[PDB]
Design a protein around this nucleic acid. Structure first.
Ligand SMILES: [Mg+2]
Ligand SMILES: [Mg+2]
Ligand SMILES: [Mg+2]
Ligand SMILES: [Mg+2]
Ligand SMILES: [Mg+2]
Ligand SMILES: [Mg+2]
Ligand SMILES: [Mg+2]
Ligand SMILES: [Mg+2]
Ligand SMILES: [Mg+2]
Ligand SMILES: [Mg+2]
Ligand SMILES: [Mg+2]
Ligand SMILES: [Mg+2]
Length: 59
RNA sequence: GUUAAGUUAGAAAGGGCGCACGGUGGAUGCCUUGGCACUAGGAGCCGAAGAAGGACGGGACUAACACCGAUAUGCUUUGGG
């Protein structure tokens, strides 16, 4: 969280895009029946949410 | 022994009264999670910066309640523990 604030508000959105891709792939695997650990969904969702929070509060 | 005349018992297809043992049913007793009437203090409005009240959604599994809103069973920060 504090290490997120060290990024230059442009790599932040690259991180957001990468996380969104990972979340979509996780849901694809869960639907197909090939996801081993399901606790990753919450982690990725919360990571995206806090990226968005930090970007918004920087205005 | 037979005959005649006479007298009196017993019986239950079923039923009645008493008792014993069960079933059904939910009274009664005990209990309280919810109510009723007040007292002292606070507060007596919300909305175009979109209200009151809702619909649909968000969980690994999700029919309902509660919580939340595509940042959705939650995000940042300051304190407590
Ligand atoms: Mg008799
Ligand atoms: Mg007979
Ligand atoms: Mg008989
Ligand atoms: Mg009888
Ligand atoms: Mg009788
Ligand atoms: Mg009787
Ligand atoms: Mg009797
Ligand atoms: Mg009974
Ligand atoms: Mg009764
Ligand atoms: Mg009162
Ligand atoms: Mg179900
Ligand atoms: Mg949004």
């Amino acid at each position: 969280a504090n290490d997120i604030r060290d990024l230059s508000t442009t790599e932040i959105q690259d991180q957001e895009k990468a996380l969104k891709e990972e979340l979509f792939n996780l849901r694809f695997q869960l639907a197909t029946g090939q996801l081993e650990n399901t606790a990753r969904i919450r982690e990725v969702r919360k990571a995206i949410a806090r990226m968005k929070t930090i970007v918004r509060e920087r205005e």
